[PDB]
Amino acid sequence: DGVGNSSGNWHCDSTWMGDRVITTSTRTWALPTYNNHLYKQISSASTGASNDNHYFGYSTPWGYFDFNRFHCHFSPRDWQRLINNNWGFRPKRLNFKLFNIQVKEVTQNDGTTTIANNLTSTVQVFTDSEYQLPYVLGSAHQGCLPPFPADVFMVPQYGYLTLNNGSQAVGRSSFYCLEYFPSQMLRTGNNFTFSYTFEDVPFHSSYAHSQSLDRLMNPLIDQYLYYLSRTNTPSGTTTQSRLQFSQAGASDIRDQSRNWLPGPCYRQQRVSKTSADNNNSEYSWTGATKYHLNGRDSLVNPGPAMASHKDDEEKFFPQSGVLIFGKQGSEKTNVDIEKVMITDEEEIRTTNPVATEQYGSVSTNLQRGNRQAATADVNTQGVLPGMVWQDRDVYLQGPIWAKIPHTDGHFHPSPLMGGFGLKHPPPQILIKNTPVPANPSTTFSAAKFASFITQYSTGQVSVEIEWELQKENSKRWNPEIQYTSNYAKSANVDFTVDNNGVYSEPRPIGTRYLTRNL
Amino acid sequence: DGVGNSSGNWHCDSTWMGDRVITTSTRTWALPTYNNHLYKQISSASTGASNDNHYFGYSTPWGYFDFNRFHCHFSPRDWQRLINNNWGFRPKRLNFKLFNIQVKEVTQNDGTTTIANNLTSTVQVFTDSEYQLPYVLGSAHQGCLPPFPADVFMVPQYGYLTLNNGSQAVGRSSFYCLEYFPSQMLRTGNNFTFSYTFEDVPFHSSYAHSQSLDRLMNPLIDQYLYYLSRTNTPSGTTTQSRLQFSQAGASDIRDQSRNWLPGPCYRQQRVSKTSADNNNSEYSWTGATKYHLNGRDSLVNPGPAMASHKDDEEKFFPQSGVLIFGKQGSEKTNVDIEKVMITDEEEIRTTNPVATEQYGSVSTNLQRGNRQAATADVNTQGVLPGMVWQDRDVYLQGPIWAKIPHTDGHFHPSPLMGGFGLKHPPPQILIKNTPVPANPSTTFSAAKFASFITQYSTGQVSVEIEWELQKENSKRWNPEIQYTSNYAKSANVDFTVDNNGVYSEPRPIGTRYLTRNL
């Protein structure tokens, strides 16, 4: 309540209880004043950007809290306790706190920097629970809570894009003043909480499949259905056309009748981790896989969920089709392939097609016998009745949820980066330093203040998510594949700080190890 | 209550409920010390001012809060939600708050500026609910709350004028010491509220009229009254005087008998937005429309409510007759016509006369037949029995109310700038920094202190007005005229910040779009 009392305790613990698990994490943040308390419009004007790259929007003084990655809520140990023992999980209930707020004035007067507290000054915070603001949290931006609890992070700036024609605004474009919403003004000794309940969402699938969609049959027994085995006969010392039918069994395993089809496909170009096997031309944009919306084409990432590679070839991956994470200390632009860690989706190829390969072939024409039969290959395939597929995998470094756009129709809302699609997601929490004016002139003037006190605020943030689990019940005799750390000696333990204090994550960890019958 | 607790939350929201609408807005202010805590008398002496320009008055250390413009309480979106859907509105109930006060000392010692808080020092505030002080809030002065919620404003200085003869005081002039009233002394951690109820006032009229006061007739049917159509006859190969009477119908639509007359007029000079069509002389003051009070003539602005122009001519406007607003970043003196936005009253010409045109004509003399009939034109017309008129329009940038002077008589108290005339308006809120002396000498002296600590205060102000609405019920078949933003593309959305952060309002928005039967 006061200056000397503490607003809240540090709770980083997690409790695994029953089929529930409750993860909690606390961090320390610092909030600068952005834009000098000004709303500004931003655009691609004067930049000389290509038609695909134009945008129009506004940047705000506000900043927002992003907890939308998994490693915020899970340690590497709590993550393998999750994925080794469980078939699925979903979030249930959420809880959020800000406490121990401190505002601090800065003084450059001497050329030295001088910092002192300010006990009176405030920080104002509102959560958008009615979803009027543009929702930014689903784009996989930087600025989320740090992986490792000992790190202090800076709160990112809020901003949004609206409709544009070129660099210009459309006129149906909208402008939001965030000052126009009810806020709670916090001072040192005040705290902020709210709680949120997730709506019912499907469990994520942490299993793989034990058997492919091709082979669901009993190999011993034979089918009672027939297929067309032979169109012609050697009879007559020359070939003549006669239709024979055969009955499909383990001898011909590819000819059997089946109830189900593989999932859909939108085809990708194939590149190899080996530098020699790739072509020497620049195909990066031209050979890419694009969609065309309102006269400007954008790249498809990652796209619909599809297998990365076939059985044999581990080195190939789809150009735009996989999630690519950077290693600790990776620069922004034109980093070599050794500086990034590429995810591998190959557990999913039991059902889904391979990203680089075609979906199938289809008859092009009618045959007569003046004309041979011809087929063409299907690169793009939309959903058909009787198709089954798996959603993309969830990673410890990846996004938890996305907001389902509000539209007349959508099909299978699961997001393409992975995670849980939500109609009402966890709301945005926006936070800003309240402006404090520098001394005004003694005579009156109607122009607004351009002079303020330089200040910033710090504090503690605590997020608590309750997860529901689906326990593995598996009758297989032989042992599962598990996620394990290699027992060999190393100069550095993985998922650990180094002698300079830097925390690094060596490789991405998918969520599907345990196996289950298709 | 304390230093660490917060005095109040930020509420800027508005709720449209039923026929009520409740608008709320919060701003940040800064209050300098004015005059060095001294009451001073001011006058036109030594300035060399013309007889019309003399004044005598007092300036005070105090400052006051002015919320008396509409765009303080309405966003541009909430304003068109108002004017498109509603025939009328009036204010009902008001609520006011000051909170999160901060007083700050200033130090120039090094030639650098140094600012620190002062937790002990106070700020004293009183509201004048008995209306003893001269009421300044009705003159459309600068210093009102900013349009856009992100702006910090400086509280304007309080002062008033009293009776003068030339630069000298009359002796019936009065002097008010504002220290002589009960005040509430606020310190950081204290807040100030009061609530106010408007007395019953007519709804403003947000409709226009569907039909002119000339044409109220049924065009199909004929009247049973007669008028004098012809005074003479061709009969006799020459003209002789014979009175014929005719019966008025759609054939002669101007001759019918009518129950009502147009509103009154006080005539204006006509100028054109086209620079070429105006005269080259300086008529600005000499050709103006003036009233003469106590031996000094002042200009009439805007004057009684009158139409701006006739049907055809959009470029002409009355010299003093319209409200003229400045565009963002318009200087004080001698700005060109492109820097100001001129209001257009033409929706009102269904009833009221055109400002530049005459009211009518009137018979000058008696006729005999040695003497022809003569008429003269009526430039000024006072109210007659059976006259109907419309009040001047309300704008988003304009004043909400005015105080009706306390006098033996007044006619139709509606103010001439527009808005609601009130006998008891919302009271004035006056605020001042309490003086803190600099160290006195150790020996005693009876002279008052000329030395003080330099300090100023800041805080938050929140105004909440409840409005009553009159919903549109209209049976017309075809669509209304609505207020719309143009859908064409533009470099800047209107009513929006620009890339430098400056908020601008492109054009004035009147309140009357919907139409209604006269």
Swiss-Prot record, chains A, B:
GO BP field: clathrin-dependent endocytosis of virus by host cell; symbiont entry into host cell via permeabilization of host membrane; virion attachment to host cell
Biotech use: AAV capsids serve as viral gene transfer vectors that have been shown to affect long-term gene expression and disease correction with low toxicity in animal models, and are well tolerated in human clinical trials.
Record keywords, A-Z: Capsid protein, Clathrin-mediated endocytosis of virus by host, Host nucleus, Host-virus interaction, T=1 icosahedral capsid protein, Viral attachment to host cell, Viral penetration into host cytoplasm, Viral penetration via permeabilization of host membrane, Virion, Virus endocytosis by host, Virus entry into host cell
Highest rank taxon of the organism: Viruses
GO MF annotations, alphabetized: structural molecule activity
A Gene Ontology term for the protein's cellular component: T=1 icosahedral viral capsid
Subcellular location: Virion; Host nucleus, Host nucleolus
Note: The ratio at which VP1, VP2 and VP3 proteins are synthesized in vivo is about 1:1:10, which is the same as in the mature virus particle.
UniProt domain comment: The N-terminus of VP1 is sequestered within the mature capsid. It contains a phospholipase A2-like region and putative nuclear localization signals.
Family: Belongs to the parvoviridae capsid protein family.
Function field: Capsid protein self-assembles to form an icosahedral capsid with a T=1 symmetry, about 22 nm in diameter, and consisting of 60 copies of three size variants of the capsid protein VP1, VP2 and VP3 which differ in their N-terminus. The capsid encapsulates the genomic ssDNA. Binds to host cell heparan sulfate and uses host ITGA5-ITGB1 as coreceptor on the cell surface to provide virion attachment to target cell. This attachment induces virion internalization predominantly through clathrin-dependent endocytosis.
Protein name: Capsid protein VP1
Phylogenetic lineage: Viruses, Monodnaviria, Shotokuvirae, Cossaviricota, Quintoviricetes
Portion of the full-length sequence here: 219 to 735 of 735
